[PDB]
Design a protein around this ligand. Sequence first.
Ligand code: K
Ligand code: K
Ligand code: K
Ligand code: K
Ligand code: K
Lengths: 85, 85
Amino acid sequence: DLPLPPGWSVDWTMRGRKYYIDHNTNTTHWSHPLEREGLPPGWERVESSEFGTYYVDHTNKRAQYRHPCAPSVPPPYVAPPSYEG
Amino acid sequence: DLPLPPGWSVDWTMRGRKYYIDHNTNTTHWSHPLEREGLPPGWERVESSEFGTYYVDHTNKRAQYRHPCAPSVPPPYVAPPSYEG
Ligand SMILES: [K+]
Ligand SMILES: [K+]
Ligand SMILES: [K+]
Ligand SMILES: [K+]
Ligand SMILES: [K+]
């Protein structure tokens, strides 16, 4: 949907997974560069049918469920307003 | 974007957070009912600018970073194909 910034292109893995090619920096990425609000450089949010939504750190070649910048404690439960309706 | 199933409506919290009202079951929800693929009943995926993406269990009033169905081990690191470009 969102336009690629100048200097990018897209391709596909042998499993059908889209990736983004940055010809400005000669690097490749799982996510659109305009869809990384709140993420530090080197980190991406990824979606998995087996593991759900998690985060990868390309600079350390590791992954974790928690956003890199989230408090290192479990996140807060909040319910929507009760049915009124 | 996606049409609401029959019997639903939408409203807004005093913080500007959208929620979904199910008049079929007299319940309320943070997420669109057609956007919960892979989630068990009672669980939702939520987005937070402070905590990132996590999951809430309305039946236990708790939250966790890991998808309820994800393996209880850290998720796998996978890099996109190296720049060719
Ligand atoms: K450029
Ligand atoms: K281009
Ligand atoms: K997560
Ligand atoms: K109905
Ligand atoms: K309606």
